[PDB]
Design an enzyme around this catalytic site. Structure first.
Site, PDB file in Angstrom:
ATOM      1  N   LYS A 171       0.216  -1.076  -0.299  1.00 12.74           N
ATOM      2  CA  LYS A 171      -0.090   0.009   0.002  1.00 12.74           C
ATOM      3  C   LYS A 171       0.188   1.549   0.179  1.00 12.74           C
ATOM      4  O   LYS A 171       0.272   2.373  -0.683  1.00 12.74           O
ATOM      5  CB  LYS A 171      -0.992  -0.278   0.951  1.00 12.74           C
ATOM      6  CG  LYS A 171      -1.757  -0.749   0.616  1.00 12.74           C
ATOM      7  CD  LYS A 171      -3.042  -0.819   0.193  1.00 12.74           C
ATOM      8  CE  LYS A 171      -4.542  -1.420   0.190  1.00 12.74           C
ATOM      9  NZ  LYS A 171      -5.661  -1.144  -0.850  1.00 12.74           N
ATOM     10  N   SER A 196      -8.956  -0.653   5.448  1.00 10.24           N
ATOM     11  CA  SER A 196      -9.459  -1.787   6.104  1.00 10.24           C
ATOM     12  C   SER A 196      -8.221  -1.849   7.169  1.00 10.24           C
ATOM     13  O   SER A 196      -7.892  -2.592   8.906  1.00 10.24           O
ATOM     14  CB  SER A 196      -9.125  -3.329   5.306  1.00 10.24           C
ATOM     15  OG  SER A 196      -8.062  -3.103   4.518  1.00 10.24           O
ATOM     16  N   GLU A 223      -9.482 -14.823  -4.497  1.00  9.39           N
ATOM     17  CA  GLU A 223     -10.083 -13.888  -2.663  1.00  9.39           C
ATOM     18  C   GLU A 223     -10.787 -14.692  -1.915  1.00  9.39           C
ATOM     19  O   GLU A 223     -10.402 -16.249  -1.942  1.00  9.39           O
ATOM     20  CB  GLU A 223     -11.764 -13.063  -4.158  1.00  9.39           C
ATOM     21  CG  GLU A 223     -11.792 -12.287  -4.927  1.00  9.39           C
ATOM     22  CD  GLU A 223     -12.804 -11.671  -4.975  1.00  9.39           C
ATOM     23  OE1 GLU A 223     -13.661 -12.490  -6.002  1.00  9.39           O
ATOM     24  OE2 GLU A 223     -13.781 -10.663  -4.320  1.00  9.39           O
ATOM     25  N   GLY A 229     -15.957 -14.306   0.411  1.00 14.21           N
ATOM     26  CA  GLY A 229     -15.802 -12.565   0.145  1.00 14.21           C
ATOM     27  C   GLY A 229     -15.578 -12.851  -1.813  1.00 14.21           C
ATOM     28  O   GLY A 229     -14.253 -12.011  -2.333  1.00 14.21           O
ATOM     29  N   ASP A 278     -17.293 -11.889  -4.502  1.00 12.57           N
ATOM     30  CA  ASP A 278     -17.271 -11.559  -5.294  1.00 12.57           C
ATOM     31  C   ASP A 278     -16.987 -10.734  -6.421  1.00 12.57           C
ATOM     32  O   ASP A 278     -17.479 -10.196  -7.729  1.00 12.57           O
ATOM     33  CB  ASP A 278     -17.712 -10.071  -5.236  1.00 12.57           C
ATOM     34  CG  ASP A 278     -17.035  -8.954  -4.276  1.00 12.57           C
ATOM     35  OD1 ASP A 278     -15.850  -9.503  -2.353  1.00 12.57           O
ATOM     36  OD2 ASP A 278     -16.039  -7.487  -4.593  1.00 12.57           O
ATOM     37  N   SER A 285       1.594  -9.833  -0.206  1.00 13.01           N
ATOM     38  CA  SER A 285       1.098  -8.084  -0.527  1.00 13.01           C
ATOM     39  C   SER A 285       1.598  -7.837   0.750  1.00 13.01           C
ATOM     40  O   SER A 285       1.384  -6.920   0.987  1.00 13.01           O
ATOM     41  CB  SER A 285      -0.404  -8.483  -0.405  1.00 13.01           C
ATOM     42  OG  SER A 285      -1.450  -9.361   0.343  1.00 13.01           O
TER      43      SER A 285
HETATM   44  C1  LIG Z   1      -6.881  -1.658   0.312  1.00  9.69           C
HETATM   45  C2  LIG Z   1      -6.915  -2.050   1.039  1.00  9.69           C
HETATM   46  N1  LIG Z   1      -6.149  -3.690   1.326  1.00  9.69           N
HETATM   47  C3  LIG Z   1      -5.869  -4.461   0.954  1.00  9.69           C
HETATM   48  C4  LIG Z   1      -4.865  -5.376   1.089  1.00  9.69           C
HETATM   49  C5  LIG Z   1      -4.641  -6.264  -0.475  1.00  9.69           C
HETATM   50  C6  LIG Z   1      -5.342  -6.478  -1.547  1.00  9.69           C
HETATM   51  O1  LIG Z   1      -5.776  -5.460  -2.084  1.00  9.69           O
HETATM   52  P1  LIG Z   1      -6.849  -4.512  -2.963  1.00  9.69           P
HETATM   53  O2  LIG Z   1      -8.001  -3.993  -1.829  1.00  9.69           O
HETATM   54  O3  LIG Z   1      -8.320  -5.490  -3.835  1.00  9.69           O
HETATM   55  O4  LIG Z   1      -6.749  -3.579  -3.484  1.00  9.69           O
HETATM   56  C7  LIG Z   1      -4.235  -8.303  -0.222  1.00  9.69           C
HETATM   57  N2  LIG Z   1      -3.165  -7.988   0.705  1.00  9.69           N
HETATM   58  C8  LIG Z   1      -2.908  -7.060   2.082  1.00  9.69           C
HETATM   59  C9  LIG Z   1      -2.246  -7.369   3.094  1.00  9.69           C
HETATM   60  C10 LIG Z   1      -4.378  -5.548   1.829  1.00  9.69           C
HETATM   61  O5  LIG Z   1      -4.477  -5.312   2.980  1.00  9.69           O
HETATM   62  C11 LIG Z   1      -6.805  -1.469   2.889  1.00  9.69           C
HETATM   63  O6  LIG Z   1      -5.831  -1.241   3.992  1.00  9.69           O
HETATM   64  O7  LIG Z   1      -7.526  -0.411   3.082  1.00  9.69           O
HETATM   65 MG   LIG Z   2     -14.438  -9.781  -2.679  1.00 11.11          MG
END
Ligand SMILES: *C[C@@H](NCc1c(COP(=O)(O)O)cnc(C)c1O)C(=O)O
Ligand SMILES: [Mg+2]
Ligand SMILES: *C[C@@H](NCc1c(COP(=O)(O)O)cnc(C)c1O)C(=O)O
Ligand SMILES: [Mg+2]
Lengths: 319, 319
Positions: free
Chosen positions: A53, A78, A204, A208, A210, A304
């Site tokens: 992020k 989140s 996913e 979830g 979707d 991620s």
């Molecule tokens: C944006 C959201 N964090 C998501 C997240 C993802 C999935 O990303 P995308 O929502 O599809 O862009 C995958 N791995 C991790 C560790 C995280 O946090 C947020 O933090 O608001």
């Molecule tokens: Mg989903």
């Protein structure tokens, strides 16, 4: 909607070069032997603030003008985008207000506050966080920087895949975690540039799915907030910018159970010596499930993030 | 004794280049801010088999002639050198017999067997493992490759520090975990080459401070096997080759408590997202204890390994 392209991912690399980590790529002899392939792991759990992020946050905030920076920004997240925005905002001297779910990992909330972010909470399953965001922003004159459905944000997330391909070359398949679609859409843009005819898979949590449903249907599918340990993937639906790209540049969307995420988390700890949060285990979990299709190929896995409450992590490792 | 020099560390780099991992160096904004310095972590927990030991094992086995390779090798180890020898031996087609303590982490014993090593056990606190090694080797005509007190082994361990200095330059202080002295002596040789006038510190668990006592006294001090969670540092005394070098090229030997090791292990997991075994936490634990002396300097920390039983690790994270 004017969709960003790989050009935007390339420019994003330039904007974040000053502060972002060029995270390492790890390999595992155990994994390669089991898969009968070459797998490469892009470790975004080693990125600034513990998740990919930071890339999208810095890319977006760096493109705000002087007046916008002074006026301040607002976001809903989140937890990881929350920390990413808080950190990026501190670096650029931008005041930041952040709306987070009340059941978010304590570590993510604590870090956000530590970076100077002003936190307001919401109920992840009952509230409309975007409605809240709009009102607070409209009332306080703050610029909203969405967690995924924004061209600058998604373009920035794509720099992780960009770096992976630049280090190990094109890959037959790239597995990416999927919540709102920022990481996946950004990754797909980079993937189609370096490996236009290869495979890109989103993953996913099963509860979830979707995104998977939307991908099959051709339109955005909305679901009630899903109950899953993948706390960064509990989105009710895909973003509009992200789905527009995913529909065109992603080959398939897979799902895995929480049980599979836990087994993956333990594997990462025991065999690769790295800490990965449940959501960051989606990609590898799916790859393992379809290992037969990966024989004699080169695979890319995006780790991620690694932000988890130690107590909860210890609990998962004990299963 | 004919002591190895940096030349031997340099040659070792050549012998292991084919199979060893050029492990990444990580940095932490949190650490840098707290220490008011620049700290660099050499991640040997990401080395083949999860610890720095692969370096010394491969360097040593690679220098055995055809007859010696066919005849087979024998070693005694707390667990990591055991796995290192087993893996290196498999790569070179050398039969290997390994003597390990009965209370060694299950993961270390399991991995050793998985690599094809024939394991025999001993009581860590009551038995003389070297007496056992000599007899079995003399009776079966096996070449003994000690876990630390051997020129080729220690020279090989030094390649980790070599790589660190080549990547980040000379450092004001280098903290190294200390058991028998292989990692420390090898590291010191590399350190004096790249930073002849800087600092090199060894670190032992407090209960097993035989090395510290030897360093102060000027002669090898022997202690009963110490009770500590640092299972790779429960040695009764330093090796002869290693002490010879340590006495000349190391500035001081520090100690930390098991409580401090646990806090360090949790820090690595929560803030750096990496899994480190208790013994691999000695160096950072000591650095934290003397942070005041490290202000405005550049520091090197060797993360020696990450091999732990997941259940036990989860237990430590829960403290
Ligand atoms: C944006 C959201 N964090 C998501 C997240 C993802 C999935 O990303 P995308 O929502 O599809 O862009 C995958 N791995 C991790 C560790 C995280 O946090 C947020 O933090 O608001
Ligand atoms: Mg989903
Ligand atoms: C050789 C022994 N392993 C030791 C070890 C050390 C200390 O090394 P030295 O004994 O002084 O060379 C530091 N960290 C870790 C993780 C380990 O294993 C063995 O395995 O036989
Ligand atoms: Mg000792």
């Amino acid at each position: 909607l004017v969709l960003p392209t790989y050009d935007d991912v390339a420019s994003a690399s330039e904007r974040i070069k000053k502060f972002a980590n060029k995270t390492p790529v790890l390999t595992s002899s155990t994994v390669n032997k089991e898969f009968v392939a070459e797998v490469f792991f892009k470790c975004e759990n080693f990125q600034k603030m513990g998740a990919f992020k930071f890339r999208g946050a810095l890319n977006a905030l760096s493109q705000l003008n002087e007046a916008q920076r002074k006026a301040g920004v607002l976001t809903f997240s989140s937890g990881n985008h929350a920390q990413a925005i808080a950190l990026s905002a501190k670096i650029l001297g931008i005041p930041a207000k952040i709306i987070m779910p009340l059941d978010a990992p304590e570590a993510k909330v604590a870090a956000t506050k530590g970076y100077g972010g002003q936190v307001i909470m919401y109920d992840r399953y009952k509230d409309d966080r975007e409605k809240m965001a709009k009102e607070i922003s409209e009332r306080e004159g703050l610029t909203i920087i969405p967690p995924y459905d924004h061209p600058h944000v998604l373009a920035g997330q794509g720099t992780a895949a960009k770096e992976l391909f630049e280090e190990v070359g094109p890959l037959d398949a790239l597995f990416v975690c999927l919540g709102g679609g920022g990481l996946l859409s950004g990754s797909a843009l980079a993937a189609r540039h370096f490996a236009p005819n290869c495979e890109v898979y989103g993953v996913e949590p099963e509860a979830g799915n979707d995104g998977q449903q939307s991908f099959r249907k051709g339109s955005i599918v909305h679901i009630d907030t899903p109950k899953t340990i993948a706390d960064g993937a509990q989105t009710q639906h895909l973003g509009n910018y992200t789905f527009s790209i995913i529909k065109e540049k992603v080959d398939d969307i897979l799902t895995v159970s929480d049980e599979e995420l836990i087994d993956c988390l333990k594997f990462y700890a025991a065999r690769m010596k790295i800490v990965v949060e449940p959501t960051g285990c989606l990609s590898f979990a799916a790859a393992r499930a379809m290992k037969e299709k990966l024989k004699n190929k080169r695979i890319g896995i995006i780790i991620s993030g690694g932000n988890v409450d130690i107590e909860r992590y210890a609990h998962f490792l004990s299963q």
